[PDB]
Each structure stands twice: as structure tokens, then as C-alpha cells.
Design a protein around this nucleic acid. Structure first.
Ligand SMILES: [Mg+2]
Ligand SMILES: [Mg+2]
Length: 231
DNA sequence: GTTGGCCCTGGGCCATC
């Protein structure tokens, strides 16, 4: 049974940032793609080998923002994301501030509840980092009433259900690895927030109903997510 | 990941930017 009822909204989420967790990173870009449960329930499965990449539902809400970090990106981070602190400031990007939190709140309020965030390795990166970024602000966390799941665990379950191999053979569950296994194509616009969100949506549309059920079964409160680091 | 949070039977696995 379900610990928090049926999720009515799935918000696929990705961030770009200044580096990996040990660097105490800051968000440089974020993308939200909100899809209603019904749009997933009515997603048509293809049984092709490989199946074609599914198209996103007609009805979606999308938000994509570039964000000026308080610290510089690592050379690696810059090279893969195509972003830098200097260039973001040049183009007048504002920081992760109260106005952004208010922006996120209004966007989230337009989505039916309960709502569940979906992010690849979200449990170990995206969710803790958002918790940290939002905790810095006086604006109450816009995500405090929302739930969240990690799509890695989701896809491990779904792929292992599909017949072998592996059959106990280990494989990568990186975003790109999954996408390529499922669709035999390289993902496009890699390590851009919107690009990776669309990639995430695609692998989540591989088995729409099975994913929805898994999400409903494993959704936990975002309020329970430990911040990546502290002030 | 160059880390570090997991799972395992002092180490191996492996993903986010
Ligand atoms: Mg990501
Ligand atoms: Mg990304």
C-alpha cells in the first residue's frame, strides 16, 4: 500500500552546480518539469527493439532558470555544463535568493497535491543541495510539503524486472547509461538542466504505469532530506 | 570523484557537478 496516497504531480528535476559534494557546491541552473499523473497513465508504450524515444505529454509546466553562484565553478563543472560564474554574472543572473524561493513556491502551487520530485541520484545530490540552498533563506521552504524519489532506484527495479541479461550482472545506472540501454541513442544536451530533465522524463516514460506505482510506493517527505552541508 | 555514502563477508561499489 501507499504511505502518502497517489502522487497527483510528478516534478522531474535536475540541477547544474559548481562541483561535487565535497566542494560544498552551489546551484548554477535548475529545471522543473511538472507532469500530471493522468498524462503518465495515458502514455503509450512501444514494444519496439529499440523503442522510439517517447514524446513529452502535451500538457506540462516547465521552469528553467540560470542562477549566479556565490562561488566559482570547478574547471570540470564548467566544461561539462557550459556555464561559469563570470558569464552568469555578465548576463545579470541573480543568486539563489528569496525571490527565487517565492518563484518556486508560486510554480509549485499551480500543481495538484500531493506532489513528488524526481531526480537522478536526487537522494545523494539534488535533494540535499536544494535543502541546503533553501535553508539559507528566510522564506519558508517551498518544498516542505512536497515528496521526493530517486529515479536510480526506480530504474534499477524496472530494468531488473525486464528479462536478462544482466541476471545478476552489474551495469551502470548513470542517466546516460540507462537512456542508451533503453533507446540505443546518446542523450542530447547533456549536463544542461533542461536537457537532462528531458532525458530523465524519457527513461521514466519507458514503463509509465510501473514507474508511477513505484513512485507512489517510495515517495518520502522532502522535509526529511538531510542538507548536503551547513552554514 | 580525486569523495563518501552505502552494502558486504578493512574493502568494494559507483553517481551527482
Ligand atoms: Mg543531475
Ligand atoms: Mg544535469
Amino acid at each position: 500500500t501507499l504511505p502518502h496516497g497517489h502522487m497527483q504531480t510528478l516534478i522531474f528535476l535536475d540541477l547544474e552546480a559548481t562541483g561535487l559534494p565535497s566542494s560544498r557546491p552551489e546551484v548554477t541552473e535548475l529545471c522543473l518539469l511538472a507532469v500530471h499523473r493522468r498524462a503518465l497513465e495515458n502514455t503509450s508504450i512501444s514494444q519496439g527493439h529499440p523503442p522510439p524515444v517517447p514524446r513529452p505529454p502535451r500538457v506540462v509546466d516547465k521552469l528553467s532558470l540560470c542562477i549566479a553562484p556565490g562561488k566559482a565553478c570547478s574547471p570540470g563543472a564548467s566544461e561539462i555544463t557550459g556555464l561559469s560564474k563570470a558569464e552568469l554574472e555578465v548576463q545579470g543572473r541573480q543568486r539563489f535568493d528569496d525571490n527565487l524561493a517565492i518563484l518556486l513556491r508560486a510554480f509549485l502551487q499551480r500543481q495538484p497535491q500531493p506532489c513528488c520530485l524526481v531526480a537522478h541520484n536526487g537522494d545523494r545530490y539534488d535533494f540535499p543541495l536544494l535543502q541546503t540552498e533553501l535553508a539559507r533563506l528566510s522564506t519558508p521552504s517551498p518544498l516542505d510539503g512536497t515528496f521526493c524519489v530517486d529515479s536510480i532506484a526506480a530504474l534499477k527495479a524496472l530494468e531488473q524486472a525486464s528479462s536478462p541479461s544482466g541476471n545478476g550482472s552489474r551495469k551502470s545506472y548513470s542517466l546516460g547509461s540507462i537512456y542508451t540501454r533503453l533507446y540505443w541513442q546518446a542523450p542530447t544536451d547533456s549536463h544542461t538542466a533542461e536537457g537532462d530533465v528531458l532525458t530523465l522524463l524519457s527513461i521514466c516514460q519507458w514503463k509509465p504505469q510501473a514507474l508511477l506505482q513505484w513512485v507512489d510506493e517510495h515517495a518520502r517527505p522532502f522535509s526529511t532530506v538531510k542538507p548536503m552541508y551547513g552554514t
